[PDB]
Every structure is written in C-alpha cells, then in structure tokens.
Amino acid sequence: GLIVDTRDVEERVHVMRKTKLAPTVAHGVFNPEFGPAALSNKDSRLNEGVVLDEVIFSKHKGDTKMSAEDKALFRRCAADYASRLHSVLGTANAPLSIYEAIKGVDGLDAMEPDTAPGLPWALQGKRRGALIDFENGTVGPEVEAALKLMEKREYKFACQTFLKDEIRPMEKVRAGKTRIVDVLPVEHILYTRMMIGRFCAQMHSNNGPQIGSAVGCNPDVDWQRFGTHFAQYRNVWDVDYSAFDANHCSDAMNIMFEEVFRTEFGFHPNAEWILKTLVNTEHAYENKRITVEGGIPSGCSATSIINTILNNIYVLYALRRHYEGVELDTYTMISYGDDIVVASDYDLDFEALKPHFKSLGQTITPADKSDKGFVLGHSITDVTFLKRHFHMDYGTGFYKPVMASKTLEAILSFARRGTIQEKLISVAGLAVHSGPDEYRRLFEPFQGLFEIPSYRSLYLRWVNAVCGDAAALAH
RNA sequence: UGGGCCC
RNA sequence: GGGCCC
Ligand SMILES: [Mg+2]
Ligand SMILES: [Mg+2]
C-alpha cells in the first residue's frame, strides 16, 4: 500500500529477535542455500549497510488509483465472480454465534487458544486465554465491549508487526527481505469469523476450479482432482506475483467487499464493514506507528480467502480489459492466496496482460524461471502450485504432489529445539512422493538417531488416501 | 500469525 | 502441541 504517515511514539512494541530455528544433523550433509530469516538489525549474515527496518516496508510502493471505467469494469467482474461463487455455495451466510466462531464448524477449524492476542493486549501481558474462554466458547468483558463497538461500527484498532521467523533462501536472508506478520487483535478475528465464518466454511468444503479456490484442500488427495482437470486444457500458465498482499489497491478491495459480501447474498450488514477496516490500517513496529492505505494485513481472519477471491477477479478483469467477450467459461483457474494456476484452450497472451494487472498495481511475471515472457503449450506437469509439482505416479496412475529436493533438504536442515522427531514424521508425508531412492537419501543423516517412517508405510497410506478403490484393487 | 491441510 | 503450504 501507501505509507501516508510515520509517527514516533514513546510506547515501544518489542519484536521477536533471535531465531528459534536451529540447524539439524542434515544441515552438515546437505548444506542448503537456505537459512533462518534475519531478525536483528545487526545480524552477522546481513549485507553491509542494510537496515532491516527499511526493507520490511519497501513492499509499500503506493496505493494505485483506478479510473471510473476500470472501477466499473472491476465491479462488473467482482459481481460476475460473486454470482458463480454464491451460486455454488448457496446463501446461508448469516452470522456465526460467538461459540461457533471460537470452536469452528464443519469446514472451519477452531481459533488457536494460545496464539498472539494483538493490540492493545500485548502491552498488558495478556494471553488469549485471559480474554476468551476457548473451552466454553465464551468471551470476557474486554472482548464483549469491543464487540459492542464493532456492532456500532465505531471500533478502532492497530496491527502488531511481527518478524516472520522462517526458513528462507540465503539470498533473501542476505538482502534482509524478512517477511512480516500483521497480528490483528483477537476480537477482530473473532468478529470477522462471526461475519463471514460460514461463508469461509462453505468455501473450504467446495474447493476446486469451479470456484477457483484451493483453500481447504489436501494436496495428497486433491492433486488427482486438480491434475486431471488442468491436463484437459491446451495451455497452462504458472503466474507469479510480487508482493500480492501489499499491492491490493483500496479501489479493488473496497469494490470486491461491496460486491461479494452483499446482504442479498445472506450476509449481515457488518460483513462488508469489518472487511473494509482492513483497507486503511495503522501498524505498530517498535517505536514507530505507521499508517498505510491499501494492501491486506496477514493476521486477518480469511486473509487467504480474500486473496483468493481477489486473484479470481483480477484474472477476469485483466482478460476483459484486453479482449472482448471474455466470460468465466473462457478459462479455468485455481488459486490459494497469491499462488495461481491458470488454463485455457484459447491461446491467451499473458505477456500483453502485464499492463492490465498494473492498472490494479499488480506485477505478473512468469514462474517458469526468469524466461523471456509467458509462452504457450505448457501443461500441468510443468507448473508449481503450493511448492508442489504435478507428477504421475508410476504404479497407481494418479497425480501426486512432488516438492523439489532442494526445498525438502532446506526444510529438513532446520528445526525448533525438541520438535525434530515430530517434524521428521510430517515431512516424511511430503517426501514420500519424491520416490523410494530420494526418500532414502533425504532421511539418510537421521538414520539411527530418530524414527524414520518406512517408504512402504506412507505409500500405502497415500494410496488409500487418494482413493479407497485402488488400495482394495491391489487385493 | 491468519485461512487451510497433516500427525 | 508440533510440522508444511499460503
Ligand atoms: Mg485464531
Ligand atoms: Mg506459482
């Protein structure tokens, strides 16, 4: 977005310095070009003269303004996508009860009982369990008074900036390109879940290209469903964005919320309101308070769904700005936030679409390396979605999600102290698709020191997961 | 850390 | 309570 004001206040909000990610035995074997993100201004691995505070907010390069015609076109696209979306999901979008918003429903997982509470509770030393009863599904006086203000639409808040402690390519670690989490207040997440939680539940349940959303998917079983779909098409594109989250313009966000979350679609009048509070935001980072116009905070409830929805509308908007007669049947797409796979039988020109995404403030680039522009003919077996390739399983004849070995090495090279055994078992569930030999190699530095699931046990587990039939057919 | 999915 | 993706 656009940074409009940078206040210096006396109250300092501390951020998590020093990584909790420790090198594992595998790090010495694989030596990956990956490492924990820089968390301190004077980190020894940082490039000379690089101030960490400056790089964090370098993504904020302006809140791009749209003309009336682009806004009317956008409204049209948001309405058209909203039509398809609500046609599939239905219109049972009435507010969730407090109990349901805390504990979740079918499709929506419960709120995390002991994550960050946000502001101003962070300045009071309070955990989430001090404000909200997660077992009973009830809230205390503080949250209830805040819910009263949100009912009245008078609620004001700030976002707590957190440095994302994560494994990153050493280039971005050296560039100081640490990603940040905008931690929102716990009552905000609660109310957003009350306003749009049922909608979010229905989205997860109905994931697939029909609604253009992979939010709620299980790549183990759904790679078959998505894989067969996109292979059916002449052209497939792996479209990359740069700072997709931050570059959502206030025009696009506002219109999207107005078109998708209308009361005629079953929503409470405040669904549109609570989401609109995400457009213009105040962020607290240490000594500085930074006011931003545009972009989406990451700690928001439904941030992935909002991003997914926007992604769908962007692609429709771009094509309609360049071509005539472009409808929702003209192409097919799946997304998960910024991650996107597009396909069509029309030889569409995504290189020509670049400026049309720029009118929304988005920069599209080919994922297929730094190759000279978007090209045609590419299939689903060439693209990457959710850091996973689409690869045919020799034996079963099903698509499987395959991660790059360099990434799997990176993941296995670092762990939070004491979580290493548990990490190995979950990552095994990812590594199984790389094949028996590569599976053996990835866990080779761990043999004798930990329990490593056999290749056979996870392969038979995956076979049953993707389909109960072929597992029984093997008998 | 939010919206998943997995143990 | 972890891990992955986003
Ligand atoms: Mg939560
Ligand atoms: Mg991609």
Residue numbers in the entry: 1 to 475
What does the paper say about this structure?
Here we describe a new mechanism by which foot-and-mouth disease virus (FMDV) can become resistant to ribavirin. Amino acid changes in the viral polymerase, selected by ribavirin, are able to modify the types of mutations produced in the presence of ribavirin. P44S but not P169S was detected in a 70% proportion in R-Ap35, as evidenced by analysis of both the consensus sequences and their corresponding mutant spectra. These results suggest that the three substitutions in 3D were selected sequentially during replication in the presence of increasing concentrations of R: first M296I, then P44S and finally P169S. To identify possible structural modifications of the viral polymerase associated with the important alterations of the mutational spectrum in progeny RNA, and to investigate how these modifications can affect RNA binding and polymerase activity, the different mutant 3Ds were incubated with the heteropolymeric sym/sub-U RNA of sequence 5′GCAUGGGCCC3′, crystallized, and analyzed by X-ray diffraction.
Since the biochemical results indicate that P44S plays a critical role in the misincorporation of RMP into RNA by 3D, and a 3D(P44S)-RNA complex was not obtained, we attempted the crystallization of the double mutant 3D(P44S, M296I) in complex with RNA. 3D(P44S, M296I) also crystallized in the space group P3221 space group, with the sym/sub-U RNA incorporated in the structure. The analysis of the electron density showed also the presence of the duplex portion of the template-primer RNA in the central channel of the polymerase of the trigonal 3D(P44S, M296I) and 3D(SSI) crystals. In addition, two of the four nucleotides of the 5′ overhang moiety (A3 and U4) were reasonably well defined, occupying the template channel, in both structures. The conformation and interactions of loop β9-α11 are identical in the 3D(P44S, M296I) and 3D(SSI) complexes, retaining the same structure that was previously observed in 3D (M296I) in complex with RNA. In 3D(P44S, M296I)-RNA and 3D(SSI)-RNA complexes the re-oriented residue R17 points to the polymerase interior, interacting with the side chain of residues N41 (which lies in the same loop of the substituted amino acid S44), and with Y285. Nucleotide A3 appears also reoriented, flipped-out towards a pocket formed by amino acids M16, P117, G118, Q160, F162, V181 and V183. These structural results indicate that the small movements in the loop, that contains the substituted residue S44, facilitate the large conformation changes of the 3D N-terminal residues M16-K18, and the reorientation of the template nucleotide A3. The conformational changes in the main and side chains of residues M16 and R17 allow the opening of a hydrophobic pocket formed by residues of motifs G and F and by M16 that facilitates the entrance of nucleotide A3. The polymerase with substitution M296I that acquired substitution P44S maintained the alteration of loop β9-α11 previously described for 3D (M296I).
